[PDB]
Amino acid sequence: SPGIWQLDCTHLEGKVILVAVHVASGYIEAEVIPTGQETAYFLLKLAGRWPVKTVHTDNGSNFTSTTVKAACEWAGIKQEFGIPEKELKKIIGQVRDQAEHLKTAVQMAVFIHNKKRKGGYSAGERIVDIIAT
Amino acid sequence: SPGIWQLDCTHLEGKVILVAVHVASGYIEAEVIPTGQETAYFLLKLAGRWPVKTVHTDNGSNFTSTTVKAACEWAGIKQEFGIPEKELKKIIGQVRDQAEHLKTAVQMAVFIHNKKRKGGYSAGERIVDIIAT
Ligand SMILES: Cc1ccc2oc(C#Cc3cccs3)c([C@@H](C(=O)O)C(C)C)c2c1
Ligand SMILES: Cc1ccc2oc(C#Cc3cccs3)c([C@@H](C(=O)O)C(C)C)c2c1
């Protein structure tokens, strides 16, 4: 559906990368964070940009953050357990020597992930096509 | 056109709020920053999320940041001078007592700005409709 996202944690250079995948398109947003506060904020910003209706996670961590819960309540996000990111670290590796900070290489890699084609449609075209329909 | 943005600086509680408006839709992204580094990063993240082709500013500040220029070069953004945000501070004022940090109230206000209708279409529906067409 248009508003189903999967949320996960990956790691590089001792830092946490928050990764939201729009399931039907493969579209991603990611951010390097230092906590629940950061995830709540990331979710609130993602919800003002796109239709975010259900967020899937793989474990119980996000069900225990009183601050994730308030962000979800505010923005009208349902959390669901049991989801309906090596590529991401692949493209970070392709670009890492183009940027001084990890966070910059992440955003360069999101850019490439979302803009490239698999002829055909990019994840960026795909999420907009799904939301238009 | 689908990729024309206007970029501006507003201020509240001694902090700088970076505001990108998609011109044809009224869609906004904003972020509280402490510099050119922050604007470059904000622009790179905005360009991986949407078609960003031309960014208009009102003064000369952004034409002097060697780091804005490299972000623009990387992502394929043209800077243009001479643009082709009280509402934003209105909705921050409506919500400010709902959040501890300014940055949270900003994102709450972006959420409302982008999701509300003027019957009719929200700025969020409008930017997706323009990009689909
Ligand atoms: C090409 C390009 C595009 C966008 C970019 O955004 C940032 C940034 C930033 C930060 C904000 C707050 C703490 S770090 C950069 C840096 C980098 O390469 O890491 C810059 C020092 C050259 C960057 C380079
Ligand atoms: C309802 C709701 C939604 C999303 C939210 O995201 C954040 C955050 C954060 C930060 C990350 C890094 C430095 S501060 C909050 C806070 C707030 O109200 O200011 C929280 C202390 C309650 C918040 C509240």
Automatic annotation (TrEMBL), chains A, B:
Taxonomic source organism: Human immunodeficiency virus type 1
Protein name per the record: Gag-Pol polyprotein
Positions where Cysteine sulfinic acid (-SO2H) occurs in the chain: 9
Top-level taxonomy: Viruses, Riboviria, Pararnavirae, Artverviricota, Revtraviricetes
Full protein stretch here: 57 to 206 of 288
Top-level lineage group: Viruses
Location within or outside the cell: Host cell membrane; Host cytoplasm; Host nucleus; Virion
Residue intervals of the Integrase catalytic domain: 1-131
